[PDB]
Nucleic acid binder design. Structure first.
Ligand code: HPA
Ligand code: HPA
Lengths: 339, 339
DNA sequence: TACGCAAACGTTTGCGT
DNA sequence: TACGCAAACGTTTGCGT
């Protein structure tokens, strides 16, 4: 039950039991064995609580997420978790659903549980949230979802969402389109506003004007893709191509088109963004901008461990890069031959 | 920094600080305030480690999962998490990927971290795993993925996967089909073998014989749905309808059909299972058996808390029930008018 | 050579007066 | 009335001899 119970069965001091258990000093074989034996019948399981109390670190990390079911998110989380495990850390998952109160709560429970570091993925960063976060500059942390380093008291991994938005637009332009519409994600997020603007730069470069009736705000959820695609194609004049800010929303856009009798890409070309695991099996196989979700995770974890173990003080930031994945949802547009 | 530092700034004993902080006894207003004030400048955050060491419970639960990205899983996890939070518990997520070693590791780290209870979702339960689990009968636990109560030392929530398999088959039969094929999930799992057998009972009842070339094993992953659908339709004689053991695999089956030029449901009818959040937005909107994922989570959490707080000793088991969701992937079969 | 003493980590709580 | 003493929870680790 307790180290004391073990030391006693083994007839050695607890100081000894602890040394064999942690190979922190040489112990006579025979001695070791005895301890192991006792450890065994006693069915001892050392208390990490006790230990952490003395050693001052819990070997545990907290993820302050937005939600965890959304494919995008879910893929990152599973990555972060992979890393913790292989480096002996334990993951504490907390979804704040973009709720300040919730954020304030989890943040606290976390601090109380004395997590060695914090991985932050809150989507939106209002001042109040930015404020609560600084109050914990003491806990080592890294934000994995900004496009620029919003603050000095944290590490940051940046996705170059603007560059990707730009890649998306260029591709459409290079395929022959000039009448393009867009369904962006929330402008309050990096993956929302960022991708959009990247996209819009390329349009401007090509002197392509995007009429406002062709821009419909989504929320990364499929229903939102569904309604937007519908509002776009449900009009007199419709674009020949659509840039959809997120794969899952795109999936929604695909379904509406089909329900309206439109053909993809024969009638409308569709390009998404994220390259979630199932994008290839959408119907038709989705052409999209890939976000390195795995590296985003691993890179974030690593910066954390650094700050952790190597007691780093300076905020760091590391970029990651998106890349176009051609599938079958895009077709040449009316101006292809003219380039 | 420490309770001691607070008691001192406040000029009261720590016994006092602790009482205000936990409202465990009456404290003079003025006294309270002082403590709060100190608590404030000191920027104190009570140590849960310390506390748990004394009180003997961590207010934290461990989820020994298989993986967390798969839509099915991801939806359950997000539910379990919702429950922990509203009941003040902290969630420790651990994916064992159906690996014994991994299982043995997480199980241990968990025990060491002294989690108040364990939510188990390992998919497959080989004796060796069944064995490791009993070694921890001491920690309160519930398995959320068996179809029958595999053991006495745990609580269990059962999904009635056989009943659902049977619902799926019946529907096809009632729609006019007699040439049906099936892509089941791994037979080593409840959601695999269970659904299949439910399905097969209905066939037998209808004297429908399922030729072996029409049964293709999947693994819940879309690629597997893709290959299987392909092997099924890639043959001389093909069924008019397909029962697909999991939505995500179904999504794969949908894509292959389209790629082979087949029409759903015009050429082939397809019925899935799970009713994952995006099934409605598949193309076409997927007809499937719904698994109450939310209730599965909440129900499991609740049984745990019970055993926890009410120190229950007896293994319990609670059933949950699936229900058919008609969408647009099924059409009447050749024998409809003949019934 | 190989191991043990005892203090400390940060809290909570029975008995007090 | 309203608060404090001090022991304990389960470990780790400096100094020993
Ligand atoms: O905020 C988001 N939510 C879901 N999917 C996403 N893909 C990019 N950003 C997001
Ligand atoms: O084991 C499974 N994996 C993924 N999805 C599933 N849906 C039912 N069972 C499963």
């Amino acid at each position: 039950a307790t180290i004391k119970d073990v030391a006693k069965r083994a007839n050695v001091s607890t100081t000894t039991v602890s040394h064999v258990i942690n190979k922190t000093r040489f112990v006579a074989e025979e001695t070791r064995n005895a301890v192991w034996a006792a450890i065994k019948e006693l069915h001892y399981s050392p208390s990490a609580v006790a230990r952490s109390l003395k050693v001052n670190h819990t070997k545990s990390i907290g993820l302050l997420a937005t939600s965890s079911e959304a494919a995008y998110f879910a893929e990152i989380i599973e990555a972060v978790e992979k890393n913790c495990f292989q480096k002996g850390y334990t993951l504490i998952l907390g979804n704040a659903w973009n709720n300040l109160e919730k954020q304030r709560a989890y943040l606290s429970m976390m601090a109380q549980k004395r997590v060695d570091g914090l991985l932050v993925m809150c989507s939106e960063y209002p001042e109040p949230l930015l404020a609560m976060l600084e109050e914990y500059r003491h806990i080592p942390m890294v934000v994995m979802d900004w496009g620029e380093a919003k603050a000095d008291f944290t590490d940051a991994v940046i996705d170059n969402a603007f560059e990707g938005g730009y890649m998306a637009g260029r591709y459409l332009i290079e395929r022959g389109h000039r009448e393009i519409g867009v369904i962006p994600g929330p402008l309050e997020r990096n993956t929302g506003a960022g991708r959009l603007a990247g996209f819009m730069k390329a349009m401007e470069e090509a002197m392509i004007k995007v009429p406002e009736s062709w821009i419909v705000q989504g929320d990364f959820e499929p229903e939102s893709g569904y309604r937007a695609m519908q509002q776009i194609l449900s009009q007199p004049h419709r674009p020949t191509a659509v840039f959809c800010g997120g794969d899952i929303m795109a999936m929604g856009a695909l379904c509406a088109a089909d329900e309206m009798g439109l053909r993809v890409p024969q009638d409308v070309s569709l390009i998404g963004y994220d390259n979630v695991r199932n994008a290839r099996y959408f119907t038709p196989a989705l052409t999209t901008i890939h976000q390195p979700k795995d590296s985003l995770g691993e890179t974030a974890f690593n910066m954390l461990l650094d700050r952790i173990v190597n007691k780093r003080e300076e905020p760091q930031s590391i970029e990651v890069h998106p890349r176009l994945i051609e599938r079958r949802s895009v077709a040449d547009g009316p101006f292809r031959d003219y380039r």
